């Protein structure tokens, strides 16, 4: 399927290139998320007219805003006190709900889907590293030290 | 010697009554056929 790309696709993203893609890939991922628009002999003239450069800056500022946001908290440290068990066996596994809420209350205002946990769900008690992706090409590292209560 | 026919008004009406026929389309066709034949008694009427 010949489609025009808006966002930077890591593999074949080139700002509106007539590059074939699987129908399922565009149908289920690109179009619903706004990363591309189906163009068939009608929007090509339109893309090169108003999408050619007008939205290029609009897309870029989103990346610039994301880069600004992820540096809001220079400390980049998260401390949460949990009533862990006796010698391990933390009370209960916690994912993104509590940590995101605490960070939002005091720290960086970020959405739920932004937080990614590469080291499980924080089972063991101690120091852990969490990779935050506010953009495809922007990755952030945050150290979390859960302390037993 | 118990015989096949053991009368019961409630069972007769609820089985072959007018409203029983109208419930289904097959019963409605039964009434339609008997109207065409001109039968005086459309169904078993109490």
């Amino acid at each position: 399927m010949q489609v025009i790309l808006l966002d930077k696709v890591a593999n074949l993203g080139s700002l509106g290139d007539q590059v074939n893609v699987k129908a399922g890939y565009a149908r289920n991922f690109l179009v619903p998320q706004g990363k591309a628009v189906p163009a068939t002999k009608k929007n090509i003239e339109f893309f090169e007219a108003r999408r050619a450069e007008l939205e290029a800056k609009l897309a870029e500022v989103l990346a610039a805003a994301n880069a600004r946001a992820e540096k809001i908290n220079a400390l980049e440290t998260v401390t949460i006190a949990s009533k862990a068990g006796d010698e391990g066996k933390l009370f209960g596994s916690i994912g993104t709900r509590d940590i995101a809420d605490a960070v939002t209350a005091a720290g960086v205002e970020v959405a739920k889907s932004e937080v990614r946990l590469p080291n499980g769900v924080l089972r063991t008690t101690g120091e852990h590293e969490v990779s935050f992706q506010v953009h495809s090409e922007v990755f952030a590292k945050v150290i979390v030290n859960v302390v037993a209560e | 010697m118990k015989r096949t026919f053991q009368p019961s008004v409630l069972k007769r009406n609820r089985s072959h009554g007018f409203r029983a026929r109208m419930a289904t389309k097959n019963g409605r066709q039964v009434l339609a056929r008997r109207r065409a034949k001109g039968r005086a008694r459309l169904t078993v009427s109490k």
Partner: protein, 271 residues
């Protein structure tokens, strides 16, 4: 206790009874009861879908709490009761907050025993905890397929499962059938073994005993005519055919599991 009754008359000679002196001698707890209309093996189409079902004593349904979601509330075992719907006895438990509930009774329970749920619970039998907090190698019962589903394994009298290994977020359990199944660590389980382990020692004695238990007579395929069963026909007990189900499927050693969806959670099969 197992008691052998004297052969005062035929039908009592082979009766072996199981008597539990601590079972409650009275009516059950009404608020937790519900009517249980029999079906006789018929489905919504009115046809017989399961054979050899019908009749039997009327029995009410006890709402047994399998989920065990009352976290952090200590509870006390009021009494043990006979449940007609289950092989295992149930226990009526009163929570500190004034709520009564029914739970499966493990082997160790007795009147006045203390039980607790939630992760912040002890290791004594009757307490329910997520399987992540349960030490490996312990015996549990009433295990959950999925978090919050309720509990489906080791529910009969004298049944249990073994926790053998814990990898990542999944746990491996050995079921009473000798099969190893992989379950999520978030699922809850109850420590200990289901009680009434002597329930398997009864023999029912006579034909009427199975009759008022809801079971109807079973007719052998050979006794039937060819038009009714794949077996049957001929003079003088002729078989000359491979055993098969009434609908033609080959029984006596043919595997019928065709799921391809839950196979990822099966580590070993029965042997």
């Amino acid at each position: 206790a197992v008691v052998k009754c004297k052969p005062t008359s035929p039908g009592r000679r082979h009766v072996v009874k199981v008597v539990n002196p601590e079972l409650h001698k009275g009516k059950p707890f009404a608020p937790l009861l519900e009517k249980n209309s029999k079906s006789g093996g018929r489905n919504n189409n009115g046809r017989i879908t399961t054979r050899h079902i019908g009749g039997g004593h009327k029995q009410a349904y006890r709402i047994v709490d399998f989920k065990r979601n009352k976290d952090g509330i200590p509870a006390v075992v009021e009494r043990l009761e006979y449940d007609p719907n289950r092989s295992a006895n149930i226990a009526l438990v009163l929570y500190k907050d004034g709520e009564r509930r029914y739970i499966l009774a493990p082997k160790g329970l007795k009147a006045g025993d203390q039980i607790q749920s939630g992760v912040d619970a002890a290791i004594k039998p009757g307490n329910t905890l997520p399987m992540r907090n349960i030490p490996v190698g312990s015996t549990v019962h009433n295990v959950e397929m999925k978090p919050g589903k309720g509990g489906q394994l080791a529910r009969s009298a004298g049944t249990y499962v073994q926790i053998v290994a814990r990898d990542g977020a999944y746990v491996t359990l050995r079921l009473r059938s000798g099969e190893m199944r992989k379950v999520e660590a978030d699922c809850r389980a109850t420590l200990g073994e289901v009680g009434n382990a002597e329930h398997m020692l009864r023999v029912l004695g006579k034909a009427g005993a199975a009759r008022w238990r809801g079971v109807r007579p079973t007719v052998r395929g050979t006794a039937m005519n060819p038009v009714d069963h794949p077996h049957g026909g001929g003079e003088g007990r002729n078989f000359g055919k491979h055993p098969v189900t009434p609908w033609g499927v080959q029984t006596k050693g043919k595997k019928t599991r065709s799921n391809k969806r839950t196979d990822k959670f099966i580590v070993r099969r029965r042997s």
